């Protein structure tokens, strides 16, 4: 019957970076999977011996999709190593730029990276724009008319009839595909909003540059605080606030209703792509030295036991290399990390990736929006509970539906909505603090000759940590352990499949030549391979 044999997807497109996915399929279902990351840069090697103040400028270039996040993690790391307690306003400004990063990032992910796995853009040409407008207006308080959507259709028609399909060339949906379910009108609404999102994300990114100089790769953080005295002014705050408000409207009125209409149409995707274990570091601190002061709290869950959330112990992280292209087989805590590349080619000596394999108490952990949302929900976070319950009820599913590719995709939207609202709270607190006469944004500090430090960021893809050993006032060791490393790194020396590998078992594949189902699950984790490998 169905397909039996290997499938390779190399390149996996609509991700950051260079990923090769290999699977074994038996009778039309995946039975085995390998996550192979195929670029190494070696930023940890390059950092050795340098000034710790320089680390954030190099590590920000780990990734320009999750731009800022690594600058923030390195600055938190060196802040921590030096023992500086940055001023309240630096925490607010850093937190506000990070909330703006999440909104930009998740909006681009859903439309520009994920949605072509679920949207047949060419079928949009056959839609009835008056019917589509009615549908769009029923799911959102924003009113959409037939002419609005016809404009999009006319534009797409001209594009397609030129024969130059550009980014849609050889799309898996061309010609039709049995795993693509949407009707023409829903394809047209999603395609209209894909196009709208291309311009909206310009504003979402601009919000970061208001305080943060520029996007991509911000330039406003220093050890001890931030540099942007202009961020105190009513004019810059107003500019930020207007971009945030417009971005939040898009989240609330365009992205989440689209997410829900697509999830409703693909409710069979509650049955694939689940994982067992979850880790999250918390984000948006009131106190830079207390993770439990964060709006989202850290936590660890094994085997979906959310009634027994475990504290996060940073000493229980080790990064494995037995199935990676590094010397030897010894796992290391990142304050004793090693980055010693040794290539053996695909599956040479059972090694198949440039990512290390982080394990927590020896277990493979999913991180990212589904970890953040489920753990916060289970901690009683009222905003996360309110919108995940509303999402579950709209979709007519129980909470077990969350342990899936569809649930992960939905969690990315839930956290976007919750963060978009929380940015307004942070913004008000920042305004209030300035109004009390606190205009301080940077604190003085001194470089120790010897120190250890760690910085924790819950980035749009999950728990990020940067770890420094300072020796003679220089970088003795600098290790990045990044969310995609957790999620998409390979097997460990106990041969445990990583979250992405395990999640792929059981994926149906209708057409091995166009294996969109594999992309749906892989993309649901929002992979970043420059992040994962560095």
């Amino acid at each position: 019957s169905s397909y039996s044999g290997p499938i390779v997807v190399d390149p996996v497109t609509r991700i950051e970076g260079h990923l090769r996915i290999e699977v074994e399929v038996e009778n039309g279902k995946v039975k085995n999977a390998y996550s192979s990351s195929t670029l190494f840069r070696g930023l940890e090697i390059i950092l050795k011996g340098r000034d710790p103040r320089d680390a954030q400028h190099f590590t920000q270039r780990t990734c320009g999709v999750c731009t800022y996040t690594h600058a923030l993690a390195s600055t938190r790391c060196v802040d921590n190593a030096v023992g500086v307690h940055i001023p309240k306003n630096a925490t607010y400004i850093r937190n506000l730029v990070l909330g703006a990063q999440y909104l930009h990032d998740h909006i681009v992910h859903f439309y520009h990276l994920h949605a072509l796995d679920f949207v047949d853009v060419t079928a949009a040409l056959k839609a009835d724009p008056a019917k589509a407008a009615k549908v769009a207006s029923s799911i959102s308080p924003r009113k959409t008319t037939a002419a609005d959507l016809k404009a999009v259709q006319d534009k797409l028609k001209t594009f397609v009839e030129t024969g130059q399909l550009g980014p849609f060339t050889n799309a898996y949906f061309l010609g039709g595909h049995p795993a693509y379910y949407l009707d023409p009108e829903t394809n047209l609404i999603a395609t209209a909003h894909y196009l709208e999102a291309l311009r909206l994300q310009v504003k979402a990114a601009r919000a970061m540059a208001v305080f943060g100089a520029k996007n991509p790769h911000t330039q406003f953080t220093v050890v001890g605080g931030v540099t942007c005295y202009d961020a105190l002014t009513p004019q810059r705050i107003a500019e930020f606030e207007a971009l945030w408000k417009e971005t939040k409207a898009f989240v609330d009125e365009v992205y989440i209703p689209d997410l829900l209409v697509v999830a409703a149409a693909y409710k069979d995707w509650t049955q694939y792509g689940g994982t067992d274990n979850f880790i999250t570091f918390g984000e948006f601190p009131k106190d830079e030295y207390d993770l439990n002061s964060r709006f989202f709290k850290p936590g660890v869950v094994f085997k979906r036991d959310f009634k027994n959330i475990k504290p996060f112990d940073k000493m229980q992280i080790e990064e494995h290399v037995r199935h990676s292209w590094y010397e030897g087989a010894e796992a290391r805590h990142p304050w004793k990390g090693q980055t010693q590349p040794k290539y053996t080619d695909l599956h040479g000596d059972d090694r198949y990736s440039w990512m290390k394999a982080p394990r927590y108490m020896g277990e493979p952990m999913e991180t990212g929006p589904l970890a953040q949302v489920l753990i916060a929900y289970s901690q009683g976070h009222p905003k996360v509970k309110a919108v995940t319950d509303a999402v579950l009820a709209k979709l007519g599913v129980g909470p077990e539906a969350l342990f899936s590719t569809l649930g992960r995709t939905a969690a990315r939207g839930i956290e976007t909505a919750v963060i978009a609202e929380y940015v307004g709270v942070m913004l008000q607190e920042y305004k209030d603090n300035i109004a009390k006469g606190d205009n301080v944004i940077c604190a003085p500090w001194e470089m120790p000759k010897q120190a250890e430090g760690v910085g924790f960021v819950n980035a749009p893809r999950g728990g990020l940590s940067h770890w420094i050993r300072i020796e003679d006032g220089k970088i003795g060791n600098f290790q990045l352990v990044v969310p995609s490393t957790w999620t998409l790194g390979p097997r460990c020396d106990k041969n445990k499949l990583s979250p992405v590998e395990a999640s792929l078992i059981g994926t149906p594949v209708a057409d091995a030549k166009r294996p969109v189902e594999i992309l749906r699950t892989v993309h649901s984790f929002d992979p970043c391979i420059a992040c994962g490998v560095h």
Binding site: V8, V9, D10, P11, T13, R14, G17, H18, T38, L39, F40, R41, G42, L43, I45, I46, D51, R53, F58, R61, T62, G64, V65, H112, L113, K155, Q164, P167, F168, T169, A171, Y172, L198, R199, Q201, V202, R206, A209, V210, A213, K214, P216, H217, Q219, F220, T221, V222, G224, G225, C228, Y229, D230, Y343, L346, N439, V440, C442, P515, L519, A530
Partner: protein, 267 residues
């Protein structure tokens, strides 16, 4: 993917962080939807293209072999150590991919300091033997237009493409092969803090009242005086740039800046 009326662009990703791709998405007047629907035909781009795997490889082959010709835009350095093994796409080294495709382009633009000059993975000790495109491919006669920065201003990419399509040739280039229309001035000579520099009015620390008042950042490491870019003129995202955010320039449009400009907080 292409043929007819819009010029074909093949966008390659080597050893890169995807910050240069993101910078193009920030394109303003024209925006990226106008660029992809009206101005150009974006025929290969791993970050946003629909096809993956063999289907993506087939799209790349059909664009590069088009009798209509294509323009290559290249992001990222080429790792050359160990015969190119540190970077592969579709199980081909990036060195091999670029060696085969870039000599077929009608024009090549190296976009971002990694593609132009080798960039962050080329910083000491350069474990992957990363090189800029023209260094890596000198022997094949490739001469890419270099649009530097980490990432560059996307104004500079669109400006160069538009120029190229109009005039059927590269604009005037400097000795680093960068367009003089964007890279002809130091960011310092354009900086609003230059009167403080002239007056010897330097911030001694980021927490200082001098920094609050906008004094010059040279003592805190600013590389504006040795960096060519149009940052103070064009700004980024239509609203800001590093020293207006209070932070020194780190020299990010210059070759080897990771090693030449460090420590970033000293001059």
């Amino acid at each position: 993917l292409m043929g007819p009326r819009r010029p074909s662009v093949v966008y390659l990703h080597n050893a890169e962080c995807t910050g240069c791709s993101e910078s193009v998405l920030r394109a303003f007047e024209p925006y990226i939807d106008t660029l992809i629907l009206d101005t150009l035909s974006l025929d290969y781009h791993e970050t946003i293209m629909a096809a993956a795997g063999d289907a993506a490889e087939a799209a790349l082959e059909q664009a590069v072999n088009s009798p209509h010709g294509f323009i290559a835009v290249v992001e990222g350095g080429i790792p050359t150590a160990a015969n190119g093994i540190y970077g592969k796409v579709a199980n081909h080294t990036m060195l091999d991919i670029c060696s085969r495709i870039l000599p077929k382009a009608q024009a090549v633009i190296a976009y971002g300091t990694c593609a132009t000059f080798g960039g962050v993975q080329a910083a000491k000790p350069n474990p992957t033997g990363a090189k800029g495109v023209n260094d890596a491919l000198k022997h094949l006669g490739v001469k890419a237009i270099n649009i530097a920065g980490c990432p560059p201003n996307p104004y500079n990419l669109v400006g160069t493409i538009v120029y190229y399509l109009k005039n059927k040739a590269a604009p005037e280039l400097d000795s680093l092969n960068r367009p003089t229309m964007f890279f002809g001035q130091t960011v310092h000579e354009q900086c609003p803090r230059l009167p403080h520099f002239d007056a010897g009015e330097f911030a001694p620390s980021f927490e200082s009242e001098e920094a609050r008042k906008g004094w010059c950042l040279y003592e805190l490491g600013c590389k504006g005086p040795v960096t060519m870019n149009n940052c103070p003129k064009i700004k980024f995202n239509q609203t800001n740039w590093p020293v207006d955010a209070g932070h020194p320039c780190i020299g990010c449009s210059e070759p080897d800046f990771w090693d030449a400009m460090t420590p970033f907080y000293q001059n």
